[PDB]
Design a protein around this motif. Sequence first.
Motif, PDB file in Angstrom:
ATOM      1  N   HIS A  45    -118.919  32.704 -72.504  1.00 10.52           N
ATOM      2  CA  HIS A  45    -118.414  32.486 -71.152  1.00 10.52           C
ATOM      3  C   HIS A  45    -119.024  33.487 -70.172  1.00 10.52           C
ATOM      4  N   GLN A  46    -119.164  34.741 -70.603  1.00  8.76           N
ATOM      5  CA  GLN A  46    -119.755  35.753 -69.734  1.00  8.76           C
ATOM      6  C   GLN A  46    -121.182  35.383 -69.343  1.00  8.76           C
ATOM      7  N   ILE A  81    -121.255  32.814 -66.653  1.00  5.18           N
ATOM      8  CA  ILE A  81    -120.960  33.364 -65.326  1.00  5.18           C
ATOM      9  C   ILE A  81    -122.174  34.104 -64.753  1.00  5.18           C
ATOM     10  N   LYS A 119    -124.281  32.057 -62.535  1.00  7.52           N
ATOM     11  CA  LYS A 119    -123.858  31.916 -61.144  1.00  7.52           C
ATOM     12  C   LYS A 119    -124.262  33.132 -60.324  1.00  7.52           C
ATOM     13  N   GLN A 120    -124.116  34.323 -60.906  1.00  6.19           N
ATOM     14  CA  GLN A 120    -124.546  35.528 -60.194  1.00  6.19           C
ATOM     15  C   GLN A 120    -126.015  35.421 -59.777  1.00  6.19           C
ATOM     16  N   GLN A 153    -118.939  37.309 -58.250  1.00  8.18           N
ATOM     17  CA  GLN A 153    -119.397  36.847 -59.554  1.00  8.18           C
ATOM     18  C   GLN A 153    -119.499  37.996 -60.546  1.00  8.18           C
ATOM     19  N   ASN A 193    -116.106  38.378 -61.804  1.00  8.34           N
ATOM     20  CA  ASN A 193    -115.613  37.303 -62.661  1.00  8.34           C
ATOM     21  C   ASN A 193    -116.117  37.466 -64.088  1.00  8.34           C
ATOM     22  N   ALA A 194    -117.392  37.801 -64.252  1.00  4.60           N
ATOM     23  CA  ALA A 194    -117.848  38.333 -65.524  1.00  4.60           C
ATOM     24  C   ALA A 194    -117.281  39.734 -65.706  1.00  4.60           C
TER      25      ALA A 194
END
Lengths: 50, 50, 50
Positions: free
Chosen positions: A15-16, A19, A22-23, B28, B31-32
């Motif tokens: 999951h990390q 993400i 997206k960054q 972001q 979020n991570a």
Amino acid sequence: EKAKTALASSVRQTHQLMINSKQLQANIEVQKIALAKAQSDYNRRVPLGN
Amino acid sequence: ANLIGREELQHARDAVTSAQAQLDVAIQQYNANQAMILGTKLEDQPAVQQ
Amino acid sequence: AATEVRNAWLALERTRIISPMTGYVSRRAVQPGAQISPTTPLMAVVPATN
């Protein structure tokens, strides 16, 4: 129980990474804005140069 | 009211858009590293149980 | 991780020994409290046919 804990940890790490994608997209957006500005500035100078 | 140059307003809008992009990058990044700390309680985290 | 969890589940479920035959119990040699290994004979099953 040990194996189950390992599975949970692996899921979280995946999951990390998703993400982090997206960054990096956000970073692309900022760079694109910079390019757009630098392009707009140049097109103001050509008529003067002519 | 046609008082200031147009390149000044262009540069203001570009700055606002760039700031928005940077804030997205920061959100972001947050979020991570929140995927690792999903479990509310410290004693229930996957690493500790192992 | 799922592979590792499946192996653990199999190891746990194999804690009940199952008889692959519809026969009769002949030479029991296992007693409660005994420490057994995958090579220790526990008992026998002899079919009543064939």
